[PDB]
Design a protein around this ligand. Structure first.
Ligand SMILES: [Ca+2]
Ligand SMILES: [Ca+2]
Ligand SMILES: [Ca+2]
Ligand SMILES: [Cl-]
Length: 54
DNA sequence: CGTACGTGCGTTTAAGCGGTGCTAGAGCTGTCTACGACCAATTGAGCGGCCTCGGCACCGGGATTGTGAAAAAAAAAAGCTGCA
């Protein structure tokens, strides 16, 4: 148990910050609990809507 | 000034009622654990700060585009007949 480094954005194959998105969900008063996929799905959508506009 | 719509007739239709019978599926229970909160410790991604240098704002000057008058051609249109 000392095996560190990887980011969730990298796991999901994304550019947008999954971790940040997660925190933002958690800190936003949206729901008491937040699934582990919730931010991944969301971030990916924001990536796509961002990419489409650009 | 033309005919698209409102009125009002007689005829036609199926909405609404009040009821009966069948059951999908809404919604409830109780059980049990995978998952998410929280936690602390650990660490590298993203922040501010800084420096650079190439895109783009600004320029002048000439090429090209777009409008309007004026003169002119084409145009419908306007006072005058004849002939019936
Ligand atoms: Ca479960
Ligand atoms: Ca910066
Ligand atoms: Ca540059
Ligand atoms: Cl989830």
């Amino acid at each position: 148990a000392r095996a560190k480094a990887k980011t969730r954005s990298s796991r999901a194959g994304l550019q947008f910050p999954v971790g940040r998105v997660h925190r933002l969900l958690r800190k936003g008063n949206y729901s008491e609990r937040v699934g582990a996929g919730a931010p991944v799905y969301l971030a990916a959508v924001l990536e796509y809507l961002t990419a489409e506009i650009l």
